[PDB]
Amino acid sequence: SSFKAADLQLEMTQKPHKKPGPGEPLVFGKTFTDHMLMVEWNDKGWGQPRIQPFQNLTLHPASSSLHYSLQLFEGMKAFKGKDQQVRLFRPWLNMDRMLRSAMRLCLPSFDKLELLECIRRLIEVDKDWVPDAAGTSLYVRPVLIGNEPSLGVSQPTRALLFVILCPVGAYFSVTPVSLLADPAFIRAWVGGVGNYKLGGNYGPTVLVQQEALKRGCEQVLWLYGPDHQLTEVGTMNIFVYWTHEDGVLELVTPPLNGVILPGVVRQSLLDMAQTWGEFRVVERTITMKQLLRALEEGRVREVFGSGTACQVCPVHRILYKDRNLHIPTMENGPELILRFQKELKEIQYGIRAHEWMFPV
Amino acid sequence: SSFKAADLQLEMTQKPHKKPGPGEPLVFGKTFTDHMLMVEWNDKGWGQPRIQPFQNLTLHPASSSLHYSLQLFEGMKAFKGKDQQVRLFRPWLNMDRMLRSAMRLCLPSFDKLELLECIRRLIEVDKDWVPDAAGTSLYVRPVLIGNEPSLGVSQPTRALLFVILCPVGAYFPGGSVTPVSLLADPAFIRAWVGGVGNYKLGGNYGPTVLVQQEALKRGCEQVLWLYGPDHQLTEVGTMNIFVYWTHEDGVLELVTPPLNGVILPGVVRQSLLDMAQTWGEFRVVERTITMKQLLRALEEGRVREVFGSGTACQVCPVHRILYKDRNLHIPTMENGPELILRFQKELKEIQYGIRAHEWMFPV
Numbered sequence: 001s002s003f004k005a006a007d008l009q010l011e012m013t014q015k016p017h018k019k020p021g022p023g024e025p026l027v028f029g030k031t032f033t034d035h036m037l038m039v040e041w042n043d044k045g046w047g048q049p050r051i052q053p054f055q056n057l058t059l060h061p062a063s064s065s066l067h068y069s070l071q072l073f074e075g076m077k078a079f080k081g082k083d084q085q086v087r088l089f090r091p092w093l094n095m096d097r098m099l100r101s102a103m104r105l106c107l108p109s110f111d112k113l114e115l116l117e118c119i120r121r122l123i124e125v126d127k128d129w130v131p132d133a134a135g136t137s138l139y140v141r142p143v144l145i146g147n148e149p150s151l152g153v154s155q156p157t158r159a160l161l162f163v164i165l166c167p168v169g170a171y172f173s174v175t176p177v178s179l180l181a182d183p184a185f186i187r188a189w190v191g192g193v194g195n196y197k198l199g200g201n202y203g204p205t206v207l208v209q210q211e212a213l214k215r216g217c218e219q220v221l222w223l224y225g226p227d228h229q230l231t232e233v234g235t236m237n238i239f240v241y242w243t244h245e246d247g248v249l250e251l252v253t254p255p256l257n258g259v260i261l262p263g264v265v266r267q268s269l270l271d272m273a274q275t276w277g278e279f280r281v282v283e284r285t286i287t288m289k290q291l292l293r294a295l296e297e298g299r300v301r302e303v304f305g306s307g308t309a310c311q312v313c314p315v316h317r318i319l320y321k322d323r324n325l326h327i328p329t330m331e332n333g334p335e336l337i338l339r340f341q342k343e344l345k346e347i348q349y350g351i352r353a354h355e356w357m358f359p360v
Numbered sequence: 361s362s363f364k365a366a367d368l369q370l371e372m373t374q375k376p377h378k379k380p381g382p383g384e385p386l387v388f389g390k391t392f393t394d395h396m397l398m399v400e401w402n403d404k405g406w407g408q409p410r411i412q413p414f415q416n417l418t419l420h421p422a423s424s425s426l427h428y429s430l431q432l433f434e435g436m437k438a439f440k441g442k443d444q445q446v447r448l449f450r451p452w453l454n455m456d457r458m459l460r461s462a463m464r465l466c467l468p469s470f471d472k473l474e475l476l477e478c479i480r481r482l483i484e485v486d487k488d489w490v491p492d493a494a495g496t497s498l499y500v501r502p503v504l505i506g507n508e509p510s511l512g513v514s515q516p517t518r519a520l521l522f523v524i525l526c527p528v529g530a531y532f533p534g535g536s537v538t539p540v541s542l543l544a545d546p547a548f549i550r551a552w553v554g555g556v557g558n559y560k561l562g563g564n565y566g567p568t569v570l571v572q573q574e575a576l577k578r579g580c581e582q583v584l585w586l587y588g589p590d591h592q593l594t595e596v597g598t599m600n601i602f603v604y605w606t607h608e609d610g611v612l613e614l615v616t617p618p619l620n621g622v623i624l625p626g627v628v629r630q631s632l633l634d635m636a637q638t639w640g641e642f643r644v645v646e647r648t649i650t651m652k653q654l655l656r657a658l659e660e661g662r663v664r665e666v667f668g669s670g671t672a673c674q675v676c677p678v679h680r681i682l683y684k685d686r687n688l689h690i691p692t693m694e695n696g697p698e699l700i701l702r703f704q705k706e707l708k709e710i711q712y713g714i715r716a717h718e719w720m721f722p723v
């Protein structure tokens with residue numbers, strides 16, 4: 001039995017913080033807003049949600065969130081249009097995804113629309129924090145952690161669902177990135193949990209990302225299997241725009257076979273391209289073997305990653321088997337990329353009205 | 361750099377918890393002692409270590425420990441012998457394993473002998489919490505977590521090291537004596553080669569909860585984790601698995617899976633190999649074990665004992681494995697269980713100070 005948005009408790013800050021300075025560098029995830037949502041669950045079901053000042057968490061030292069990684073998160077954006085109106089991009093898919101993560105970790109179920117409403121209310125209260133400068137947004141970070149005060153590994157009897165907000169500018173995306181493609185690093189496995197947005201999938205990538213910087217790359221290209229499938233880039237889904245082995249122009253991204261996180265932007269790019277009907281759009285396994293041949297034969301136009309933070313990130317170099325592979329993404333416009341960026345921007349900032357946007 | 365035991369600050373508690381009484385059996389991991397260790401790290405390095413009252417943590421909402429699972433833990437035991445002297449079992453090895461975990465997650469390094477001293481100092485303060493009844497001990501849980509107040513996925517600039525203590529009795533109900541049943545379904549993967557299954561990291565355990573529930577639903581108490589096309593037996597629950605049998609070459613052997621990435625290198629595991637190796641009475645090997653081999657060893661009556669090892673259980677017999685829909689009887693209890701009993705007996709004598717040994721670290 002879910003918490004309800006009707007029952008919200010508002011508690012406004014006693015001393016508001018000073019928003020970032022216009023033009024000053026908004027660093028991603030370092031700056032937070034005045035308020036936060038917090039909801040507690042226990043053996044008396046969910047409690048009343050509350051909007052409250054950005055305050056620390058008080059956890060029992062045995063909290064299962066900290067011992068056995070009973071934690072999952074989401075990530076989505078609110079955009080402030082010209083008319084100072086704020087909109088969430090396809091938040092329903094994030095609520096869908098968060099509930100699936102919750103179940104995977106035996107965490108408590110909740111009503112998707114109730115949480116979206118509390119999020120709406122939370123953003124409303126802090127709507128001024130939502131910046132309006134070009135390419136800026138409010139990053140929204142929901143989290144659900146276990147909070148069992150016992151060392152047993154078991155279905156928790158207690159949990160906390162909370163939400164924080166960051167004004168953001170950018171994360172790197174007009175400029176492309178280099179990838180490290182080393183098969184020894186494995187992000188996720190079939191029958192694993194790489195397809196859920198659980199905190200435990202990210203911690204182990206930190207050292208890997210360091211090795212990429214050490215080898216002069218900016219991101220990890222997570223390979224999988226003996227045929228070296230391209231699964232994902234850092235925390236982004238991967239797309240390739242190429243002329244395929246059968247001479248047909250297509251946009252491919254790996255299918256959702258377990259080792260791919262089902263990105264909201266990924267789906268949106270699939271959706272958007274289908275609607276155009278101008279080229280083939282497919283979900284198919286992509287191997288290094290295939291990418292090398294394609295590059296040698298000049299059939300590759302663009303490689304890019306997708307995700308909420310970067311939206312669409314061009315790729316121009318992959319360090320594979322100790323040798324750099326050039327990727328002509330930037331030579332080729334990048335047309336598909338710039339076109340995707342434009343329409344997403346038009347939609348997100350309200351230029352074109354669209355069912356994907358949810359107004360705050 | 362590191363924190364130093366010489367710099368320990370002590371804040372004794374002003375509100376002692378009521379210790380557990382008689383007719384109140386110990387539930388594993390639910391009862392905590394009066395004090396905790398706590399050490400913070402940041403840009404200025406490791407702060408000063410302190411033993412303080414058992415209290416809640418105060419965490420920034422963006423704490424990387426909660427969003428990207430920058431968390432690891434340990435688990436070891438303190439045993440009070442008949443003379444009332446308290447000893448830790450091979451703690452050095454837990455410190456070795458904790459530092460390896462920390463490096464894998466880019467968390468701050470520390471001096472093992474310094475943490476161990478702090479842990480000793482901690483247990484000394486809460487010495488009266490250590491039970492002395494047969495099969496009771498004090499379970500010690502160190503933890504290291506990232507504590508960056510930033511949603512970026514990166515090497516943290518702040519961490520928190522803490523240690524809490526639990527007086528414990530048995531882990532399973534009538535545990536180590538009464539055997540357990542296992543669900544062995546190859547749909548479930550605990551870890552993969554090139555993953556982090558060989559580190560004691562929080563992230564490895566949360567996904568298993570649902571699987572544990574599936575074993576209950578199917579009438580089993582534990583999960584036998586299989587890996588690979590040839591269904592290798594990796595671990596059981598949170599224990600390393602061992603098989604004592606007459607292998608296909610007709611030689612009597614104790615086998616356990618090798619440390620090739622999907623196996624958590626348990627201290628009890630390592631100890632059982634050391635003990636058996638030392639004895640020199642049968643062949644002791646680290647080798648992959650597959651279901652095909654087990655099925656064949658069973659139908660040819662070559663298996664004597666199957667069991668799990670780990671700090672909580674110690675040595676745990678298995679009597680049944682449900683392989684998809686085939687219910688396999690494991691004759692562990694009909695074979696004594698002779699090796700299990702021997703291991704338990706020698707571990708008991710070492711742990712409770714019946715027989716002085718270099719494996720025990722006096723508190």
Ligand SMILES: *Cc1c(COP(=O)(O)O)cnc(C)c1O
Nearest residue numbers: 235236237261263264265307308
């Ligand atoms: C969050 C995430 C993505 C992209 O998700 P969006 O919903 O598009 O922002 C891709 N891959 C991984 C591994 C992720 O964690």
Ligand SMILES: *Cc1c(COP(=O)(O)O)cnc(C)c1O
Nearest residue numbers: 598599600624626627628670671
């Ligand atoms: C802790 C643990 C073990 C056993 O470790 P010991 O050091 O023997 O207590 C075995 N397997 C897993 C998965 C573990 O987490």
Ligand SMILES: O=C(CO)N[C@@H]1CCCc2ccccc21
Nearest residue numbers: 235236307308309310511512513
């Ligand atoms: O939204 C995206 C994709 O561009 N990345 C975000 C950026 C913050 C760090 C992080 C960590 C885990 C999962 C997503 C993310």
Ligand SMILES: O=C(CO)N[C@@H]1CCCc2ccccc21
Nearest residue numbers: 151152153598599670671672673
């Ligand atoms: O000591 C052992 C093995 O017998 N298991 C412990 C028991 C507490 C629960 C847990 C959770 C994760 C890793 C180890 C453990």
Ligand SMILES: [Cl-]
Nearest residue numbers: 195256258262
């Ligand atoms: Cl999926």
Ligand SMILES: [Cl-]
Nearest residue numbers: 558619621625
């Ligand atoms: Cl190892």
